[PDB]
Write a protein that binds this ligand. Structure first.
Ligand SMILES: Nc1nc2c(ncn2[C@@H]2O[C@H](COP(=O)(O)OP(=O)(O)OP(=O)(O)O)[C@@H](O)[C@H]2O)c(=O)[nH]1
Ligand SMILES: Nc1nc2c(ncn2[C@@H]2O[C@H](COP(=O)(O)OP(=O)(O)OP(=O)(O)O)[C@@H](O)[C@H]2O)c(=O)[nH]1
Ligand SMILES: O=c1[nH]cnc2c1ncn2[C@@H]1O[C@H](COP(=O)(O)O)[C@@H](O)[C@H]1O
Ligand SMILES: O=c1[nH]cnc2c1ncn2[C@@H]1O[C@H](COP(=O)(O)O)[C@@H](O)[C@H]1O
Ligand SMILES: O=CN(O)CC(=O)O
Ligand SMILES: O=CN(O)CC(=O)O
Ligand SMILES: [Mg+2]
Ligand SMILES: [Mg+2]
Lengths: 337, 337
């Protein structure tokens, strides 16, 4: 089958941790990244050890899953190589593949992203250079992965590989970056990322026609977060975030998250435009601590269950995945309901 | 259901003429149009009168239908108002709706697109300003349709309208621009347009999840064409294009189209990444003159049928629409197979 994982809020909803579980649990042949580039920080906890990737998909754990990066994604050579080293224990380097049509993040781009009054001060961007690079790509002057000789051993056709796999019945897992709220089209412009992030865009990033997409999982966290500036309707004061212990720092910039309550009307909208078939809710332990570690649905505390059900009815999409903690095992899998 | 129409070559495959037929024939409630923007020239012949639109979707013909422009599309106010005027007898002004999140083409964009040595001289672009506009949008500096007061009476939520329609069971027809060969990701970079053009991107442009897309029509012409520079594998000398009477001029720029022989390998690739369910072939009358006007498959000349069948086997997708001339009636509809 086909599964696409996207964010339903402003990113950082726990997409990495979910692609993580699905990789190990469902054993996909191919696990691919779509999204923008390296502006994303996806974290996963593996038996007490927290990892964080930006370029390589969050599934390296699967020593038997081909790891791919779609043509629509930006590639930062420095970051890609650092993560080859950072994940050597998983033999990532032998299982990885960069589409030869990917655009390249150069140091001129990182610079611009890090210095300019508008992207750095006002928006304010990540500094990954993803913004200015796509601008160069739109202007068709940026270079492609084909033109970087240090990347030649890893060059491939991700679009072909993925489609070739789908023909033989193999399972393909696709990872998107950010969340619906950061969509260049449907997000809170101009406080967004440099590209649409919805499931349709992610499919185009890896090279999959919309008809070939079987499942679309949209990830939500119990308390939505925003890094950087921009409107946040259900935003809470920072004093409350502490009290409820909702303090988190960026995985790339290291800046505080801005925390808020679950926006249901936004959730319904985000889920529907994505064409969500299944919802996934994370950090339920942060909504109610008594739900920590729980792996069966009906052993959830009651205050936790009325949250999942309130979501399921005000969004109109079943929740088939509930994460109850940082660890892999901290997950409820209601794929049979 | 849902049908998305996209190009399989380098644009100008007759997408307009096909969205045309489908609008009148199948009577869709909505007829959104994706693509990049106004850089597209879509022509249709209505009972001897040839029309050409850039902003308003082909399908204005259908007076019962709602005409929409997805948020992912660029909007040129001048062109939009000119085409409201160019098409009054169809009363487009009342049935049209622009997504309030569309980015705006300003004259600063147009000038740079027409003058700059790289975009104008090497590529060379259309001059619609779609390139620089998207660059300004990626940089999140562009204006949105909400911010243009002259556009307020036509502002709407295309994503909502389309999805609301798909819930009532209504038919939604979606029009894309260009062709696969001009895709920013998978086309002939840098000789491409400023955005991915495949069906998944087109779906994201209007606000439709990949799971909500029922049918994907990829349009091919008997002899592929290229406007502007860039690689063209099966390109013929211009002497042969006149010899075969294959001379066509740009709908927008009036530039003469480079002509070539049917590229079968590029068609299978283009069709497959698009996730094509159905093929549509136009200008069969240009491949064999004896096929002109034929509206039934049974009566096509032999040389005509071995072309359609050679396509069907070397591309691996059934051809359910065969256009045999400029007029609406000049069509073979094998959608029942
Ligand atoms: N307490 C708790 N933490 C979780 C749970 N699920 C995931 N996390 C952690 O929450 C953190 C936030 O997620 P991110 O690191 O931003 O990963 P992401 O959602 O892929 O981020 P983006 O790529 O920017 O979209 C991660 O470090 C996870 O380890 C959970 O159920 N409970
Ligand atoms: N002779 C003949 N002409 C056709 C046929 N189908 C379409 N045409 C004409 O061919 C021309 C070329 O198409 P375009 O005007 O570029 O429309 P398009 O394919 O939507 O162009 P793009 O928007 O750039 O993708 C149109 O003016 C049509 O009127 C056909 O079957 N036979
Ligand atoms: O993965 C991420 N998680 C949360 N926000 C992000 C992430 N990546 C980019 N953003 C936001 O997107 C905007 C611009 O980022 P950029 O253009 O990708 O560099 C800023 O508001 C960032 O905070
Ligand atoms: O609709 C069209 N038909 C054929 N080629 C197009 C069309 N629109 C843009 N192009 C091509 O796309 C390139 C750049 O156009 P732009 O989208 O205006 O920047 C040039 O090669 C153009 O000829
Ligand atoms: O995931 C990325 N962030 O949360 C922003 C940052 O790294 O600062
Ligand atoms: O369809 C548009 N073109 O063929 C380019 C032009 O109009 O010049
Ligand atoms: Mg993150
Ligand atoms: Mg055209």
């Amino acid at each position: 089958p086909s599964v696409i994982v996207v964010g339903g809020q402003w990113g950082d909803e726990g997409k990495g941790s979910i692609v993580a579980y699905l990789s190990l649990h469902d054993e996909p042949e191919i696990i691919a990244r779509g999204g923008v580039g390296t502006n994303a920080g996806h974290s996963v906890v593996i038996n007490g050890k927290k990892y964080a990737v930006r370029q390589i998909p969050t599934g390296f754990m699967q020593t038997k899953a081909r790891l791919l990066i779609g043509a629509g994604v930006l590639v930062d050579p420095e970051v890609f190589f650092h993560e080859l080293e950072q994940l050597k224990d998983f033999n990532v380097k032998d299982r990885v593949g960069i589409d030869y049509r990917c655009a390249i993040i150069e140091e001129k781009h990182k610079q611009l992203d890090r210095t300019n009054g508008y992207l750095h001060g006002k928006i304010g961007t990540t500094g990954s250079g993803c913004g200015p690079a796509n601008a160069d790509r739109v202007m068709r002057k940026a270079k492609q992965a084909k033109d970087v000789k240090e990347l030649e051993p890893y060059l491939t056709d991700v679009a072909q590989e993925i489609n070739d796999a789908l023909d033989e019945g193999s399972l393909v897992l696709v990872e998107g970056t950010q969340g619906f709220g950061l969509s260049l089209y449907y997000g809170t412009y101009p406080y967004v990322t440099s590209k649409d992030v919805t499931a349709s865009s992610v499919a185009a990033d890896v090279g999959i026609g919309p008809t070939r997409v079987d499942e679309v999982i949209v990830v939500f966290k119990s308390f939505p977060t925003r890094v950087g500036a921009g409107p946040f309707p259900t935003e809470m004061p920072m004093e409350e975030a502490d009290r409820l212990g909702l303090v988190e720092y960026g995985t790339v910039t290291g800046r505080r998250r801005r925390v808020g309550w679950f926006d249901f009307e936004m959730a319904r909208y985000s889920a529907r435009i994505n064409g969500a078939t299944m919802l996934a809710v994370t950090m339920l332990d942060k909504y109610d601590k008594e739900a920590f570690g729980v792996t069966d649905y009906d052993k959830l505390p009651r205050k936790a269950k009325e949250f999942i059900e309130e979501i399921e009815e005000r969004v109109g999409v079943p929740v088939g995945l509930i994460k109850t903690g940082p660890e892999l095992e901290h997950i409820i899998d209601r794929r049979d309901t």
